[PDB]
Design an enzyme around this catalytic site. Structure first.
Site, PDB file in Angstrom:
ATOM      1  N   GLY A  64      48.352  46.179  37.403  1.00 48.76           N
ATOM      2  CA  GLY A  64      48.812  47.046  36.339  1.00 48.76           C
ATOM      3  C   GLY A  64      47.709  47.277  35.332  1.00 48.76           C
TER       4      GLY A  64
ATOM      5  CB  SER B  92      45.339  40.312  38.695  1.00 48.34           C
ATOM      6  OG  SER B  92      45.648  41.656  39.010  1.00 48.34           O
ATOM      7  CG  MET B  93      49.103  42.929  34.214  1.00 49.60           C
ATOM      8  SD  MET B  93      48.019  41.911  33.201  1.00 49.60           S
ATOM      9  CE  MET B  93      49.019  41.683  31.742  1.00 49.60           C
TER      10      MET B  93
ATOM     11  CG  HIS C 288      40.449  38.936  39.715  1.00 45.80           C
ATOM     12  ND1 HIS C 288      39.361  38.120  39.921  1.00 45.80           N
ATOM     13  CD2 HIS C 288      39.965  40.197  39.642  1.00 45.80           C
ATOM     14  CE1 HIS C 288      38.265  38.853  39.958  1.00 45.80           C
ATOM     15  NE2 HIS C 288      38.602  40.117  39.793  1.00 45.80           N
TER      16      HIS C 288
ATOM     17  CG  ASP D 279      39.375  38.649  44.388  1.00 44.63           C
ATOM     18  OD1 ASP D 279      40.429  38.505  45.040  1.00 44.63           O
ATOM     19  OD2 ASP D 279      39.013  39.734  43.887  1.00 44.63           O
TER      20      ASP D 279
END
Lengths: 187, 233, 174, 101, 193, 165, 133, 172, 179
Positions: free
Chosen positions: I50, I79-80, I104, I153
């Site tokens: 996002g 990551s979001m 991340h 990652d």
């Protein structure tokens, strides 16, 4: 029509070989590019000496300002000019066919197709900008019509009425109309 | 010294070459015939440097240019015209430069028309010499450019006015008042203003008068409401 | 939200005027004439202008309405929202204090050749004459300075335009 | 770096930079990506070998310093690490020439 | 271009339709003309006496679609009064002229344009004969009907419409197309002595 | 002789390329006459500054431009940081060049870089990018210099054409 | 000493065929025209333009004959004028074919109407070619 | 949006344009027609917008009768930030993690020296008007605000509290 | 069907999270709070990422809610979504046995004059610090370790995350947790 044809001693390109004999083949519709090349060629050919310049035209149309520039360059040079019509001369090409050698030096091939029409143009902007452009284009119509009338010998008012639409001519109609002077045959 | 060797270059080097550009450069003819641009300016500078170095013999300059471009297509800069003009002014004291306008000379090229050696500067009678509205059709800047932009365009427009008064011997106030709309001179008006020194009438003239088109009929009777016929000539 | 204002007799002439939008506004003004020949019709304007054909059609519709027509300016009224902004009743033309109003002369389209260009240039001279005439009529100004100012695109603040004559009130006095 | 020792030149504002090798996007199973990783690791060890021979450092050290992340070197930083050795011969600045005139 | 704003517009159009006000907007083409013909036929069906009003605002359109609309106007029982708002160009003009005799109005600042049909032709030579003959037939029919409506001679219309003929509505009253101008009295501003 | 001649009329170009041409002009052991005509943006201005002092001419209608490089970054957070360090170090490189070509304080030059700064001929002399305004007499002298320098090669060419003819 | 024109052209604008036919007839020493593979309209005119007695076609070659093509755009009167010239072009092409085939010109016009294909022997019989390779 | 709209919620979301401004203005005028007293709240999340549309929204906010409380959600950037700063005094809220940006106007121009100079000084007019209004809304002087708007000024909600754009945070 | 689930105080956050998507979810959470203050909300997160701005908008909405807001990740949380899943109430964050959780940093860029480039680098660095600070608090792990991990990652299984402090329960009793 690419192959270089042999010259006095070497291989030279076909169109350069022609211009070595004062012959100027115009084969594309007159855009800024072709008109500049032919104006340059005319000036240099007049520079070499003053004998005469034959223009063989296959022009299917073109733009008005470059064609008038080419016409004025043809008239400016010392050496006379004759225009032959191989193939066809449309619009401003049919105006170039009436640009060289008023005294009986416009020829045409037997099945050449000739056409004249009032010069086109298009431009927009403000109101006053359109006024200026429209006035200039009317000046251009009138100038090209004066040139056509004095080339062919037809009344100016007749030319104005005739060329408002497209005008097409067979070489017999072009002789009878005064557009050209002779039709090439086997001789 | 170098006259016989322009001759010898003609004999061995400059006769055979095929390109029309090469033949023209052999004849000391520079045809400015395209929207003047960066490439055109560098070419003209190279040609004019080499043409000086050949001999103090004269140069012929034919101008059929529509300005830096047409108003319906992306413009370039005004700096190409200034570059060529400065090169020509530097050259002229050591080489005559006849400048002749075939066809058209719009705006920037008009400067290049007026930059020929005085008394050797001509345009055809059927040409037009436009001092067109100033300038810059480039519109790809932002507001973060405003603080610079004014100090450019004046910086360009005023530079031209100055150079034009150094070619027409006129007052730059007139040139500034004339920029505001595209004012395009006839050759005779141009000689009057000073842009060119002569006008090249053709050997033979063709176009005659068309005033025989005028009607000249009587004034309309007061009792004849004219219809709405909107005609064409 | 627009329809819920169209029951309160409000028309939004927002965005560039084009054939479809102008046709919609003409239809709405016909409808509002139909509903009540007396109640006020308010038109909110926010536009960089558009066609002079469509704008003149909207003007004709606005002066067909037997009801009163108020005009309010939000933000940008430019070259045809200014023309239609001044077209409200004398004494009922308003703008926001931070609205910009810019006056201009019409623009035309392109089809053909020099005779056709003659035809279009005659059109646009007529349109410029008509816009100058009407605009110099409701601003109570001579045609000389209207011809002068329209030919130069110059944005105007609401107090400046109010001194000019386009608008009668500024909402807030600012 | 792979030029002669003592004969690597640069312009005094050249920008030098060392980054890990990069492959281009190819599609497949985990085996294809593993094969690409093997190839890229051969390439990384190759560059580390050349940089070790040039800069005179430990092989894995040269792998860590240069090829591990995209790092930038000015001319002075590059000279500090053995990347370059000299400016081009005869390079003399303009105002320096002026003040020696 | 906004589907929701288009929905507002169709709401307004339907509310108009309930008042027997039909709309001719945009270039006349097949689908708009079919819709317009359906509207006219229904308004014929409802009542055989009450007048229909046809708002006209079009910069042009095909000749066969416009003639479908024109024949539907002239077939139904109610008198269709055409009214030009904005501009009626070259088939809005024909439809505007074709309205009920005595009920062709226009707004004061509208613009009425007439000219001979635009079109095209492609294919072999004989197909071009066919298509040119058909365009010329469209021109002959439009000019004949315009001469019939406007009260002029077929020669005058043929020569005027040869190129783009633009007219103000007072001009079109005098010429023959429109029959009145719809404007309300405006207070007479008093000038000095 | 062999003193290079650069003719400069350029409205743009990456700043790094201007720095490269500047240094290239720098390592040539003979002189270097750089003449700017009409315009010189950042890259071409760096080229102009690189001529021999006493031979950086600018024409009256020439407008040079001191400004910092225009860039664009795409990558991770560390990539963003390291690349912005690229660009800042390039700004300091250009400040260094403009000081060692103008004697202006690097603070003032960096400010001039911050907002794109145009200069006309007299002011371009004033800051230190050029030494002489190329007016018409200056331009005459320049084409004379070209005459004298090219005439050695011209004489060689004379004798060769004498032999061949 | 005689222009020997090898022809293999699947198409082309008919007006260009007329122009090449005129260019052929312009030179006085005869022209030999040998068609290979195909000779369409703009090249069928060229093939018919060689010296009668010296026009050859190959066993595999096929000859196309058709009326000219065109696109028009403009007002009704512009369309009328442009139609009139395309008809003039078609009449001229029929006349050229009549000169080379010695066949009724109206019949040749009827045969031009749609795309017309001739085998090598039918090319010989029609008259566009004289002999087989 | 309707689900929010009946809650007297007006969403200024995404970069402003003239269509978005028309929608905002219609919503605000309708909502003032419904109830002139009970408050309007308005969520701000926008990276910019045309200056004229923002000015239209700002004037519509000003002269209507209900107070238009502005609550920033996510981001407010230099034209949505001016709109956020223009909510009713004491009722300009921020979410605790939102960011606030102020920076100068933008836009291009093309034409003659005269026309593009006119565009230049209208951009100067926008800049002057925005600085004056920001000085009215924050309390800082023309000089500090002009320096701030001169270069991209990213700020945290708390700083905006002591710099005057916001009145409080919704940690509540 | 989402109407019935919204009646049951279940909010779905699925697919890419964006500005408008955020505004919609923020409104749903505010509605569920203003209707009922004592009954928990469940937010389901299947999202590949996002915008940081929109994500922090939704996170602020989640932290405002009086009614404890549980989260239940299914499939992806990249990551979001993973940050928002870690922003549920402690002890009431759940995941499927085979969801994939990614932590991340964000991407970015800048252009033109490098003044805006330095400002964008400063803003991307702010996003890094802001997200990591709250991540460290709820994962109950040293900020240095979180800063190092948010760089790398990598996906993790809900077992690894449950060890790492992000989620607290796995729906499935770790009987279908596959590596």
């Amino acid at each position: 029509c690419r192959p270089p044809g042999q010259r006095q001693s070497e291989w030279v390109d076909l169109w350069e070989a022609y211009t070595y004999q004062k012959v100027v083949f115009i084969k594309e519709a007159i855009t800024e590019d072709v008109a500049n090349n032919m104006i340059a060629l005319t000036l240099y050919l007049d520079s070499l000496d003053q004998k005469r310049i034959y223009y063989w035209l296959n022009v299917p149309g073109g733009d008005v300002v470059p064609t008038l520039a080419l016409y004025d360059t043809m008239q400016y040079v010392r050496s006379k000019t004759a225009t032959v019509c191989y193939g066809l001369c449309l619009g401003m090409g049919g105006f170039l066919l009436t640009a060289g050698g008023e005294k009986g030096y416009r020829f045409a091939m037997p099945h050449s197709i000739l056409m004249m029409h009032h010069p086109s143009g298009a431009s927009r902007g403000q109101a006053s900008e359109m006024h200026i452009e429209s006035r200039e284009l009317v000046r251009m119509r009138d100038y090209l019509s004066l040139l056509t009338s004095n080339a062919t010998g037809q009344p100016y008012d007749r030319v104005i009425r005739e060329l408002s639409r497209n005008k097409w001519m067979d070489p017999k109609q072009a002789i009878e109309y005064g557009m050209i002077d002779k039709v090439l045959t086997t001789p | 010294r170098k006259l016989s060797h322009l001759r010898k270059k003609l004999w061995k080097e400059a006769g055979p070459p095929p390109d029309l550009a090469t033949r023209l450069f052999s004849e000391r003819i520079m045809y400015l015939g395209m929207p003047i641009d960066s490439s055109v300016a560098e070419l003209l500078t190279a040609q004019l440097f080499v043409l000086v170095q050949e001999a103090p013999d004269p140069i012929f300059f034919y101008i059929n240019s529509t300005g830096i471009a047409k108003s319906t297509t992306k413009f370039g800069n005004e700096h190409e015209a200034i570059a060529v003009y400065s090169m020509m002014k530097g050259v002229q004291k050591y080489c005559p430069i006849y400048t002749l306008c075939v066809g058209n000379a719009f705006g920037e090229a008009a400067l290049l028309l007026s930059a020929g050696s005085p008394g050797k500067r001509a345009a055809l009678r059927s040409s037009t010499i436009m001092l067109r509205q100033p300038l810059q059709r480039l519109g790809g800047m932002q507001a973060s450019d405003i603080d610079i932009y004014r100090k450019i365009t004046r910086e360009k427009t005023a530079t031209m006015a100055k150079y034009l008064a150094a070619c027409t011997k006129k007052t730059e106030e007139q040139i500034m008042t004339d920029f505001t709309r595209p004012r395009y001179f006839n050759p005779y008006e141009a000689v009057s203003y000073g842009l060119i020194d002569t006008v090249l009438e053709p050997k033979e003239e063709r176009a005659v008068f068309k005033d025989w088109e005028k009607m000249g009929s009587e004034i309309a009777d007061l009792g004849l409401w004219d219809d709405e016929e909107q005609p064409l000539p | 939200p627009f329809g819920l204002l169209l029951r309160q007799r409000i028309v939004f002439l927002g965005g560039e005027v084009e054939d479809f939008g102008a046709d919609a506004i003409i239809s709405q003004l016909l409808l509002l004439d139909s509903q009540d020949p007396t109640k006020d019709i308010k038109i909110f304007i926010n536009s960089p202008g558009g066609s002079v054909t469509a704008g003149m059609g909207i003007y004709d519709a606005m002066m067909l309405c037997r009801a009163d027509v108020n005009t309010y300016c939000f933000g940008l009224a430019a070259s045809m929202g200014a023309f239609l902004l001044g077209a409200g009743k004398r004494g009922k033309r308003n703008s926001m204090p931070n609205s910009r109003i810019m006056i201009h002369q019409p623009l035309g389209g392109a089809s053909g050749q020099a005779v056709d260009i003659e035809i279009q240039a005659k059109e646009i001279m007529y349109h410029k004459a008509n816009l100058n005439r009407i605009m110099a009529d409701y601003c109570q100004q001579p045609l000389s300075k209207i011809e002068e100012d329209t030919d130069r695109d110059r944005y105007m603040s609401p107090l400046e335009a109010k001194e000019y004559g386009l608008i009668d009130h500024i909402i807030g006095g600012e | 770096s792979a030029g002669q020792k003592g004969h690597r030149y640069s312009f005094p504002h050249a920008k030098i930079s060392t980054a890990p090798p990069v492959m281009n996007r190819v599609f497949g199973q985990a085996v294809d990506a593993q094969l690409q990783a093997n190839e890229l690791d051969y390439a990384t060890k190759y560059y580390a070998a050349i940089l070790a021979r040039s800069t005179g450092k430990d092989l894995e050290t040269c792998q860590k310093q240069y090829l591990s992340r995209k790092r930038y070197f000015s001319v002075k930083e590059a000279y500090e690490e053995g990347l370059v050795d000299k400016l081009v011969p005869g390079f003399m600045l303009n105002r320096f020439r002026k003040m020696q005139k | 271009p906004n589907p929701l704003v288009i929905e507002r517009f169709q709401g307004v159009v339907s509310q108009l339709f309930q008042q027997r006000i039909v709309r001719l907007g945009g270039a006349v083409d097949d689908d708009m003309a079919n819709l317009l013909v359906a509207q006219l036929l229904y308004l014929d069906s409802v009542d055989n006496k009450r007048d229909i009003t046809m708002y006209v605002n079009s910069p042009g359109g095909s000749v066969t679609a416009g003639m479908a609309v024109f024949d539907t106007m002239r077939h139904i029982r109610p008198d269709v009064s055409t009214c030009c708002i904005g501009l009626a160009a070259s088939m809005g003009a024909f439809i505007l002229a074709s309205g009920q005799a005595g009920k062709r109005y226009s707004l004061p600042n509208s613009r009425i344009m007439i000219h001979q049909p635009l079109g095209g032709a492609q294919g072999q030579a004989t197909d071009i004969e066919i298509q040119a003959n058909e365009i010329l037939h469209h021109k002959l029919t439009l000019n004949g009907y315009l001469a019939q409506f406007t009260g002029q001679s077929m020669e005058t219309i043929t020569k005027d419409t040869d190129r783009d003929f633009f007219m103000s509505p007072q001009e079109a009253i005098e010429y023959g197309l429109v029959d009145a101008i719809i404007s309300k009295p405006q207070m007479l501003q008093s000038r000095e002595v | 002789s062999k003193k290079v001649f650069m003719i400069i009329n350029s409205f743009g170009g990456s700043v790094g390329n201007g720095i490269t041409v500047h240094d290239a002009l720098q390592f040539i052991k003979a002189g270097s006459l750089t003449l700017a005509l009409g315009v010189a943006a950042s890259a071409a201005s760096l080229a102009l500054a690189g001529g021999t002092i006493g031979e950086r001419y600018v024409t009256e209608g020439c407008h040079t431009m001191i400004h910092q490089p225009e860039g664009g970054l795409n990558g991770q957070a560390s990539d963003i940081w390291i690349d912005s360090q690229e660009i800042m170090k390039i700004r300091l490189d250009v400040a260094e060049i403009y000081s060692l070509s103008t004697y202006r304080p690097r603070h003032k030059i960096l400010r001039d870089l911050d907002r794109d700064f145009y200069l006309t001929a007299m002011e371009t002399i004033y800051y230190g990018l050029a030494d002489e305004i190329a007016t018409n007499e200056v331009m005459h002298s320049i084409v004379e210099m070209t005459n004298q320098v090219w005439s050695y090669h011209d004489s060689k060419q004379e004798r060769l054409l004498e032999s061949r003819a």
